[PDB]
Amino acid sequence: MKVLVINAGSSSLKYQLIDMTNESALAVGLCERIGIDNSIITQKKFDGKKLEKLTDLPTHKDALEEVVKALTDDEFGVIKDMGEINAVGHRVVHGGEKFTTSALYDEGVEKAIKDCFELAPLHNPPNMMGISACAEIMPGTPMVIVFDTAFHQTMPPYAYMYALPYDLYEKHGVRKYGFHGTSHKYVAERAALMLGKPAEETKIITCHLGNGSSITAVEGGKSVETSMGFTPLEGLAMGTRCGSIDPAIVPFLMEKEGLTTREIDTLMNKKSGVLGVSGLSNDFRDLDEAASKGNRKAELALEIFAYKVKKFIGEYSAVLNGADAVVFTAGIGENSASIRKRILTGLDGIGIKIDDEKNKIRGQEIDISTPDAKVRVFVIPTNEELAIARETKEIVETE
Amino acid sequence: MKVLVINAGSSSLKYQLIDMTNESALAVGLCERIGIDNSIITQKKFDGKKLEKLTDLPTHKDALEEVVKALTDDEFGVIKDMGEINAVGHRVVHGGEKFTTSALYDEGVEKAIKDCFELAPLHNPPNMMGISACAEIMPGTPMVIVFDTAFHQTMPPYAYMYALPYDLYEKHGVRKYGFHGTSHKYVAERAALMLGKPAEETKIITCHLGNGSSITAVEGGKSVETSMGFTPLEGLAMGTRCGSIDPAIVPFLMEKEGLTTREIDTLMNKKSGVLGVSGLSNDFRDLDEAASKGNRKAELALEIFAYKVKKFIGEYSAVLNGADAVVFTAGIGENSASIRKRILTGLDGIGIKIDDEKNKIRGQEIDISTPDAKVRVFVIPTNEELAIARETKEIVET
Numbered sequence A: 001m002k003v004l005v006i007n008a009g010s011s012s013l014k015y016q017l018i019d020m021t022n023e024s025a026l027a028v029g030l031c032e033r034i035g036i037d038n039s040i041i042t043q044k045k046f047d048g049k050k051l052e053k054l055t056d057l058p059t060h061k062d063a064l065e066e067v068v069k070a071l072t073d074d075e076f077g078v079i080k081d082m083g084e085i086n087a088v089g090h091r092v093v094h095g096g097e098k099f100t101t102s103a104l105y106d107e108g109v110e111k112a113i114k115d116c117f118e119l120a121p122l123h124n125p126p127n128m129m130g131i132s133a134c135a136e137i138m139p140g141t142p143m144v145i146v147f148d149t150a151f152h153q154t155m156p157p158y159a160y161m162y163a164l165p166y167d168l169y170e171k172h173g174v175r176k177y178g179f180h181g182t183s184h185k186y187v188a189e190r191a192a193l194m195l196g197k198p199a200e201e202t203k204i205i206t207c208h209l210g211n212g213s214s215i216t217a218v219e220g221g222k223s224v225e226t227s228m229g230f231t232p233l234e235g236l237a238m239g240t241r242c243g244s245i246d247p248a249i250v251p252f253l254m255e256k257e258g259l260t261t262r263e264i265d266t267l268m269n270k271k272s273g274v275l276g277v278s279g280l281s282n283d284f285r286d287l288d289e290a291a292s293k294g295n296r297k298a299e300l301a302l303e304i305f306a307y308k309v310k311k312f313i314g315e316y317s318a319v320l321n322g323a324d325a326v327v328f329t330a331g332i333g334e335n336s337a338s339i340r341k342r343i344l345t346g347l348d349g350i351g352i353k354i355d356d357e358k359n360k361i362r363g364q365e366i367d368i369s370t371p372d373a374k375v376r377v378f379v380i381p382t383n384e385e386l387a388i389a390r391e392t393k394e395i396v397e398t399e
Numbered sequence B: 001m002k003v004l005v006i007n008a009g010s011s012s013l014k015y016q017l018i019d020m021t022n023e024s025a026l027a028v029g030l031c032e033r034i035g036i037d038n039s040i041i042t043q044k045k046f047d048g049k050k051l052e053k054l055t056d057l058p059t060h061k062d063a064l065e066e067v068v069k070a071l072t073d074d075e076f077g078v079i080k081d082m083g084e085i086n087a088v089g090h091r092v093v094h095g096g097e098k099f100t101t102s103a104l105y106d107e108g109v110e111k112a113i114k115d116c117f118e119l120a121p122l123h124n125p126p127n128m129m130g131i132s133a134c135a136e137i138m139p140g141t142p143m144v145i146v147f148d149t150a151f152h153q154t155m156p157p158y159a160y161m162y163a164l165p166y167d168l169y170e171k172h173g174v175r176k177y178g179f180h181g182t183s184h185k186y187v188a189e190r191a192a193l194m195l196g197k198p199a200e201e202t203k204i205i206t207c208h209l210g211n212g213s214s215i216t217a218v219e220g221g222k223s224v225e226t227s228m229g230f231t232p233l234e235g236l237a238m239g240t241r242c243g244s245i246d247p248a249i250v251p252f253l254m255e256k257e258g259l260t261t262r263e264i265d266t267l268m269n270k271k272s273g274v275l276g277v278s279g280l281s282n283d284f285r286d287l288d289e290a291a292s293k294g295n296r297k298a299e300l301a302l303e304i305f306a307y308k309v310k311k312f313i314g315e316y317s318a319v320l321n322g323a324d325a326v327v328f329t330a331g332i333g334e335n336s337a338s339i340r341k342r343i344l345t346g347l348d349g350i351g352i353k354i355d356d357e358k359n360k361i362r363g364q365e366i367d368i369s370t371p372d373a374k375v376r377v378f379v380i381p382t383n384e385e386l387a388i389a390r391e392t393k394e395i396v397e398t
């Protein structure tokens, strides 16, 4: 069986065709600037051959057609016809209270996603677009949905409950959810393996740092606590997200600037984070370079980001009464060695120590902590696509 | 030195005269029913002698001129003339920026106190009715203003700034200020003495647990991080406060419930906390009972509260790169061996352990941790008036 995993964003679309027979990633591509000028799609074959097509991509639909065209490229493709795509896995951030486990797509599931648009303004609408593009290009192909909140469902009440009037939890299902679950679960299993101990016996602090970032306290292979909550805004500072700020600032900023609830939401989700502090951009790579060239703002922005990650690391050490290892994955966590250093410096007092040199290695699963450090520090590249393709393989077969 | 600590109120006036030589409270009083009927002033002298005088107290200025009569009483007083009162210290919760240290009241220091009203969403603006009194009743005498937010002015930028648009900090002052400064500092000083080392060489985690709660990371005697922020709302769940929740919830609630800005703020500061969860009381002592009596919501509210505090202990363990001791103060922190247990259990992984027997003791400086524990856990009662007295003294010296 072959599965196309889809990851949609407002104007981007990450895809990946995986051969479930030997779980090999036949091809990995990306569509950018969907809706802007100079639309483009890049693809990389398992043999290295790369493709790039400059062609206007107005909607996620057009891009999904170019995707099928790239996948079936006579020489740079990996298949002959669209029919070779047996199923399609989709990433969906919020499924709501009702949907928290991978599920075959149906009118009902589509209802829950849209209904949750307000719970994940930056992701669900775009994920939904990908799902639609999909239905407009390959209607006959089975579709499975995998939710970011799934993995965090084993949290205890004293953790997912907010200290608000109890009726809010009943009247509106307002509780902590968490996201990036599918990623936190994958790298967590990887850590258990690099530890040599069985999952049930390990205590790990997984760190997903990308456009969005979140930490999770995995005990015995199960999420017991996570940085994000009701929505993907709570927690760490991110690309354009403010994270856990004093809530009183909302009403305050609303009165002082006379902003509407809609506006204060867009401000917290699209104009804050490192973008808001740096005043430069949301790309941590850009910020890294700009900070190293003398831009105080970019410097301050990354300073706030690493420090916040550091505090959460200490915060989950108490939760787990001692963590065996800390895991860095995702865009920033896998590639950035500099930001990683910023996050881990000054933590030898809680067992964390790292080899500055081994820490300079590229994208490789490796222990970057001193061999004597009580706490291991793995840099594990994430692979949600496989996690999603695996989930998609099961649902479609098990009826 | 002899300091007079005052605490103005709606129609009351609490005060204390402390001899800084032995930091002993010579006398302590309270003027009740001010600006109304049945005006009364009650003073207690150290050697068990209480005075109750029914003089009428129109304006606070008279309530202070009476505190003079009482402090100088032939038999119930403690001083001959008003001249023995070297300085006067009053506490003001909101100190905001500017005031990185206590300020010796004058014309300037009063402006910033009045200026900071609409520039901050605090509920109880400075009751200057107390300070005003001193302005006249006691002219040639240093009057110090101790701010509950100053102690945190040592926080670095990457800590007090929020990951919000920079313009907000620059044009509206949005940053983390923190509160309970005097208490955290007082207990942080006591902790260093208990560790038997200079404050400078100590890293301490101070915990102020009361109706309102906050945690402060103390590095070398200076505040470097604290749980509350722009307002007392941020941080832990408290008696009626929700603390740091997902910000998205605010605009969400306002939409679903059709609330106003002022309404949503009231819901988070007064209708939330352990009160909102248990739906019983904002009082922990009563919740502790209900809890052991099988009250679910009650039990749930205590788990959330203790858990949060725990999360902050580890969070600050990373900030201070290892803490030497954790301090518990304030009402819940001084008298609840129940909650302290909920908080400290399951932390041997980060070097924290407690002696159940030593944890039963109420109100008294003591190390309740085990002798093998790497992190000392002290129980230190906080003395607000003496804390403001110490503070007032130092500003009077330099």
Ligand SMILES: Nc1ncnc2c1ncn2[C@@H]1O[C@H](COP(=O)(O)OP(=O)(O)O)[C@@H](O)[C@H]1O
Pocket (backbone or CB within 6 Å): A014, A209, A210, A211, A212, A282, A283, A284, A285, A286, A288, A330, A331, A332, A335, A336
């Ligand atoms: N080498 C790098 N240096 C700095 N930041 C990086 C680097 N690689 C990735 N990042 C960060 O990760 C972001 C995207 O990561 P992520 O959200 O995981 O998406 P994706 O991995 O699909 O690009 C980039 O915009 C940047 O902020």
Ligand SMILES: Nc1ncnc2c1ncn2[C@@H]1O[C@H](COP(=O)(O)O)[C@@H](O)[C@H]1O
Pocket (backbone or CB within 6 Å): B209, B210, B211, B212, B239, B282, B283, B284, B285, B286, B288, B330, B331, B332, B333, B335, B336
């Ligand atoms: N013995 C106790 N056990 C549990 N809670 C207590 C006890 N004594 C006081 N409290 C709580 O601690 C807080 C002290 O308030 P404050 O003095 O303002 O810090 C109040 O909200 C009380 O309910």
Ligand SMILES: [N+]
Pocket (backbone or CB within 6 Å): B093, B232
């Ligand atoms: N307050």
